[PDB]
Design a protein around this nucleic acid. Structure first.
Lengths: 37, 100, 206, 262, 143
RNA sequence: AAACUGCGAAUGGCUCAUUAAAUCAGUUAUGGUUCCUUUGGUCGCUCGACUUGGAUAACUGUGGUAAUUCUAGAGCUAAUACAUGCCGACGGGCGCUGACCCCCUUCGCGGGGGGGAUGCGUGCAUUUAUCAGUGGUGACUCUAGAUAACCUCGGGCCGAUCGCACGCCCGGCGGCGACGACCCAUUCGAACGUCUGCCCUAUCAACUUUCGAUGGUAGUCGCCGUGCCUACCAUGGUGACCACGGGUGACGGGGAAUCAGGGUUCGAUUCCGGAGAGGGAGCCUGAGAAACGGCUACCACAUCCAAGGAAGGCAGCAGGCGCGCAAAUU
C-alpha cells in the first residue's frame, strides 16, 4: 500500500508538475508576446 | 530461621525496621504488613521491630535444615503440592523434557 | 507545594489579592535540579499529561557543536567558569543553560588532524611517539592528497581557539537545559562571543 | 470540574436535536469522534427520535448491537456516536440509506438517498499538512487524515471520497459561482452560489452567497461547504432546497397545502 | 555601544562565527500591512521582545492609544481614553485604561503625546501583553 | 464463586463559606500549552524464537490482637501483571571514507574527468549546532528537506497477546475481528492570556517597593507565556476618570418580582461558569485531583477500648440533635 500509493502520487505529481511547467512556459510565452508587442 | 511473628497486642513484625519496640510507618503498595485498597494509597500502619525480645505473642519459625530425629507433628506428615505446573516451559524444566 | 501561581502577589496598582481558591496542582513548582559535574546521575520525573522529564543531578559529558565547520562530538565537561545569572553558581559548579564551561578539545583536535591533516594543539618542539596520527598526517594517494591540499588552502583557525586547543580545554556555552531534558549539549564560543566572555572572566578574575 | 464532563443536561443539549423538555434530566452526551458536540447528531437521537424505529434508549442498544447500522461505510455499535454533516447512515436489513444534510431550519432531517448515492460522500478539508517524509496530508471536517492527495486541493475545498476504499474521486475548488451549503450560524441549512469572498487579515474572512431566488446573505467562511461546481450539486437535496422561504411565505404555503388537500 | 549585560546579547537565528577567507541581521514582516521600519533592518540593537527582530508574534487584537510615560526601559505606558454609556442617565462618562506596552528601540524618536498603534501578543512581562507596531507623531510637532 | 489484570472511582449529587477587576458575561487568542477516550492516519521506512525468565494472589494449611474492610509465616500455581528479548523484511540503496584502477592534453612533471576493495554511519521520537529555501499563514525562529552528532540503565516506538469460521496450495501462504502501541491529526476538554463591563464607603487620599513593588538581562521551575522564582541592574507602577484600605444579610451570569415611558429591587435555588467538603496545610496514584464516600500531619470537636491501641468526616439520599419566625419519608 505504501509503495503503490507513493508510485500513484509520483505519477499524479509528475502530471501536475508538467501542467504547471506548461504554465511556466505559458507565462514565459506571454512575456515572449509582450517582448514582440 | 526466625521469619518473625506478632507483638502481644497483635502488631506484625517488619523485615529490617531495626528497633525492638512498635514504630509507625508509611506503607505503600510493595510493602509487608499492608495491602492497598485504592491504587497508590499509602496508609500509616503501626508495625513491631525485627529485633526479637520476650515481649511477643508468636514467633513464626521455618525449619531450614532437618535435624537427627523425626519430629511427630511436621516431618512424619507428607503433603504433595496442591497444584501442578501450567506454563509449558515450567513443565519442560520440571520433567527435564526436550524441545522436539 | 512550592507554587507557580499568579494570584499570590500584588496587582499593577500595588493592591494585595484575597485568594479565592487553594493551591491547584497544575500551579506546580518542583525543587531546582542544581545539576553538578560528576558521574552521570539523571532522575526521571513524571510531569503533566503522564509525560517524562529527566532531572540531571550530576552530568560530566555533552554533545557540544563547533559551528565554524559544523562538527559536534560527545566531550567531557571539566569546569564551570562563568554564569551571567548568579555569580555563586560558579563556586557550586552548577550546570544551567547559558553557563560558560571548559570542555575537552581532543575530539575536535582528533577531527581537525584527521580531516585537515595539519598538526593542531601540539606545543612546538615535541613529536608524536606512538607514530599513529604522525602517519595520519602523511601517506596519501595522487588525487586525494590534492583533495586535502584544496581543503588545506582555506584551513585557517583563529588565534583564540589555537591558544585554547593548545591548553587542551575549549570554552563552551550550554544551550540545552540539563534540569529539563537531562542533557548538557551546547556550542563552542568563537569570534565576538569568545572575546566578550574572556573579557567577563578576566574582569571577574581581577 | 477537575476532569472531563461525562453527562449532558437535557436543557443544555443543542436546540437542533429537538429533544423535548419533560422526559429526562439528561440528554445523550455524544461520544468523542469525527464531529463536534454541538455540530453532530448522536445515533440514538437519529434512530429513536427522527425515524422512531425504537421507543426507548434500551431498544436503540438492541438495534445497534445486532450490527444493523453502518455510518459512512463502517458498522458502529455506540448509541451516542456523533453522526454529523454529509455522513451516510446505511440501515442494511431495512435496505435504506440516509445522508445527514441540514434542512432549511438548523436541524438535520430524514433525507433518504439511493444505494448508489450512499457509496460516496463529500468532505470539506480543514488543513493541508506535509508529513514526516514530504508526504502531503489533508484533514477533512470529519477528521479523515487522507495522505497523498491531489496538489490542487487547498483548504476550504471539498473532496468526494468513496466510503469502501476511503480515496478521493473528484473535488470542488473554493471559487466564485460554486454552490454552498451553510453549516454554521443563523444561515444554517441555506444553499446558494458563492458570489463574493471578503478577506480580513487576522480576523475572520466573510463570504456573501446569492440564493436560487436572489436572496443574498453573508456567512463566516468557517461555516461554509461547497456541494457542487456552478449550479449542479454532487448530492441529492431535501425539499426547500436550502432556499429559506420567509415565515410569511411558509404560513402561505402551509395554509395553501392544508386547504387544497382537505 | 551594546552588550552591557553580564550575558552575551545576540539574535538567536543568525550565526556570526562562520570561517572568513558586518554581521547579517534577522527581521520579518509583522503582517496586517504594517511596514517593518528602516531602523529595525539597518540598526544594530538586539531585543528578544521586538515584533520585527524578536521571538514574538502579533495575533488577535490591534488597538491604539497616546504615549503618556517613557520612564521604564524598552517599554512605555500608553493611555486609552473612551466613553462608557450609563443607560439610566442616557449619557457617556469619560473613562481611561493605561496599559504598559513594550517599545522596540527601532522607534528611536518617540515623544509623549504620540498616537501609537499596539498589537496583542503573548505576555512579555507581568503587566505587558502589547508590542508597539507603528508610531504616528503628535498633532503639529513637526519641530 | 473467588483472585490477579484492565478500566471507572476527577462525572453525578450537595452547599454558597470564601471571593469586589477576583469570580462571571460578551469578545479574541493559544504562532505560548497539555489532553485517557473517540475518529482517521501511521504501526517489513532502522541494514543489526513453532514463543524466553521467576515471582505472587485466589486455593491449601498454621496463626496473633480486646478490637478494624488489621494482617503475618509456610506449601503451590496463571498472564494483555512485572520482566527479558530474537528471527524476518534483507538484496541492497544513500553520505562519508578511501586502498586500487581507467581515459584525455603535455618530451615528462603537471593539468582534467570516471569506476572502486575495506571500514564508519544512516527510520521515526529525544537533545544540540549548522546549511538551503515541498506545502501553508496576515505574519514563524512553521511544516518538510539536508549535514553533523546525542540517545537519560529512575531506559520512547519497531506486537513473545486473545477469539470466530478455517481453507487453498509439494511444511509454506491466507479471511473476519478483540486488545495494545511511538507519533500526528480530530474529538472531549482543561489551563493561561486580550478588549470591555460590578454594590456601598473619603469619619479610607495617597498607596505599592531591597521577605518583588513596575521594568530590563540571563537562568531556575513549569505542560507552556510571564517576577512564577532566583541573581544582577534600572526607579519605576497606580490615583480625584476615586488608586490603596474598609464594609457587604456579596459566589457571578442566564434570569425573577414590580414597571406608561424611564427605572427600582432581587437572583442561596434545578441551566452555564466558579469555589468548598469541620479549619488550614502537604502529597500518592492517574490522561485528568492539590481528590477528602483517597492518603499524611497539625488545630478543633467527637467514637470503640481488656488502657496496649484502633477508627472518623451526611455543605450526598433518608434521618436525628441543635439553632431558630422558618423548611417533608431512616
Amino acid at each position: 500500500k505504501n509503495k503503490e500509493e507513493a508510485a500513484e502520487y509520483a505519477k499524479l505529481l509528475a502530471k501536475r508538475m508538467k501542467e504547471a511547467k506548461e504554465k511556466r512556459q505559458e507565462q514565459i510565452a506571454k512575456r515572449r508576446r509582450l517582448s514582440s508587442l | 530461621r526466625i521469619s518473625g511473628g506478632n507483638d502481644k497486642q497483635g502488631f506484625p513484625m517488619k523485615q529490617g525496621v531495626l528497633t525492638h519496640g512498635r514504630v509507625r510507618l508509611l506503607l505503600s503498595k510493595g510493602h509487608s504488613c499492608y495491602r492497598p485498597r485504592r491504587t497508590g494509597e499509602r496508609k500509616r500502619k503501626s508495625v513491631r521491630g525485627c529485633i526479637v525480645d520476650a515481649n511477643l505473642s508468636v514467633l513464626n519459625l521455618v525449619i531450614v535444615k532437618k535435624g537427627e530425629k523425626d519430629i511427630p507433628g511436621l516431618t512424619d506428615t507428607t503433603v504433595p503440592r496442591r497444584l501442578g505446573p501450567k506454563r509449558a516451559s515450567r513443565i519442560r524444566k520440571l520433567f527435564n523434557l526436550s524441545k522436539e | 507545594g512550592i507554587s507557580r501561581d499568579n494570584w499570590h502577589k500584588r496587582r499593577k496598582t500595588g493592591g494585595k489579592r484575597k485568594p479565592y481558591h487553594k493551591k491547584r496542582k497544575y500551579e506546580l513548582g518542583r525543587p531546582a535540579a542544581n545539576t553538578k559535574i560528576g558521574p552521570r546521575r539523571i532522575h526521571t520525573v513524571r510531569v503533566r499529561g503522564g509525560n517524562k522529564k529527566y532531572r540531571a543531578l550530576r552530568l560530566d559529558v555533552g554533545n557540544f557543536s563547533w559551528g565554524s565547520e559544523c562538527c559536534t562530538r560527545k566531550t567531557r565537561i571539566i569546569d564551570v567558569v562563568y554564569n551571567a545569572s548568579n555569580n555563586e553558581l560558579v563556586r557550586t559548579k552548577t550546570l544551567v543553560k547559558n553557563c560558560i564551561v571548559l570542555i575537552d578539545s581532543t575530539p575536535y583536535r582528533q577531527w581537525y588532524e584527521s580531516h585537515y591533516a595539519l598538526p593542531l594543539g601540539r606545543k612546538k618542539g615535541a613529536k608524536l611517539t606512538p607514530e599513529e596520527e604522525e602517519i595520519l598526517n602523511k601517506k596519501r594517494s595522487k588525487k586525494i592528497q590534492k583533495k586535502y591540499d584544496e581543503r588545506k588552502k582555506n584551513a585557517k583557525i583563529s588565534s583564540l581557539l589555537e591558544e585554547q586547543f593548545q591548553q587542551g580545554k575549549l570554552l563552551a556555552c550550554i544551550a540545552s537545559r540539563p534540569g529539563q531534558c537531562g542533557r548538557a549539549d551546547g556550542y563552542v564560543l568563537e569570534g565576538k562571543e569568545l572575546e566578550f566572555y574572556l573579557r567577563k572572566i578576566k574582569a571577574r578574575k581581577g | 470540574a477537575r476532569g472531563p464532563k461525562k453527562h449532558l443536561k437535557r436543557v443544555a443539549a443543542p436546540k437542533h436535536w429537538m429533544l423535548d423538555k419533560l422526559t429526562s434530566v439528561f440528554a445523550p452526551r455524544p461520544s468523542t469522534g469525527p464531529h463536534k458536540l454541538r455540530e453532530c447528531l448522536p445515533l440514538i437521537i437519529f434512530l429513536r427520535n427522527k425515524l422512531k424505529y425504537a421507543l426507548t434508549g434500551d431498544e436503540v442498544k438492541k438495534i445497534c448491537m445486532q450490527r444493523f447500522i453502518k455510518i459512512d461505510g463502517k458498522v458502529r455499535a455506540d448509541i451516542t456516536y456523533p453522526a454529523g454533516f454529509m455522513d451516510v447512515i446505511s440501515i442494511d436489513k431495512t435496505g435504506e440509506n440516509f445522508r445527514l444534510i441540514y434542512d432549511t431550519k438548523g436541524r438535520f432531517a430524514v433525507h433518504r438517498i439511493t444505494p448508489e448515492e450512499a457509496k460516496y460522500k463529500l468532505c470539506k478539508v480543514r488543513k493541508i499538512f506535509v508529513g514526516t517524509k514530504g508526504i502531503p496530508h489533508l484533514v477533512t471536517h470529519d477528521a479523515r487524515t487522507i495522505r497523498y492527495p491531489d496538489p490542487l486541493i487547498k483548504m476550504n475545498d471539498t473532496i468526494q471520497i468513496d466510503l469502501e476504499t476511503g480515496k478521493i474521486t473528484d473535488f470542488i475548488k473554493f471559487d466564485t459561482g460554486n454552490l454552498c451549503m451553510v453549516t454554521g450560524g443563523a444561515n444554517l441549512g441555506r444553499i446558494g452560489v458563492i458570489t463574493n469572498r471578503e478577506r480580513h487579515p487576522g480576523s475572520f474572512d466573510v463570504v456573501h452567497v446569492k440564493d436560487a431566488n436572489g436572496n443574498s446573505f453573508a456567512t463566516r467562511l468557517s461555516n461554509i461547504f461547497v456541494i457542487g461546481k456552478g449550479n449542479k450539486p454532487w448530492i441529492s437535496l431535501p425539499r426547500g432546497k436550502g432556499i429559506r422561504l420567509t415565515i410569511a411565505e411558509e404560513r402561505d404555503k402551509r395554509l395553501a397545502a392544508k386547504q387544497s388537500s382537505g | 555601544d551594546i552588550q552591557t549585560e553580564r550575558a552575551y546579547q545576540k539574535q538567536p537565528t543568525i550565526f556570526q562565527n562562520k570561517k572568513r577567507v558586518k554581521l547579517p541581521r534577522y527581521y520579518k514582516n509583522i503582517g496586517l500591512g504594517f511596514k517593518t521600519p528602516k531602523e529595525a533592518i539597518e540598526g544594530t540593537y538586539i531585543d528578544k521582545k521586538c515584533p520585527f527582530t524578536g521571538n514574538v508574534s502579533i495575533r488577535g487584537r490591534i488597538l491604539s492609544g497616546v504615549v503618556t510615560k517613557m520612564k521604564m526601559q524598552r517599554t512605555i505606558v500608553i493611555r486609552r481614553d473612551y466613553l462608557h454609556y450609563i443607560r439610566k442617565y442616557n449619557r457617556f462618562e469619560k473613562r481611561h485604561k493605561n496599559m504598559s506596552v513594550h517599545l522596540s528601540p527601532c522607534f528611536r524618536d518617540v515623544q509623549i503625546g504620540d498616537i501609537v498603534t499596539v498589537g496583542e501578543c503573548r505576555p512579555l512581562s507581568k503587566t505587558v501583553r502589547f508590542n508597539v507596531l507603528k508610531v504616528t507623531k503628535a498633532a503639529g510637532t513637526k519641530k
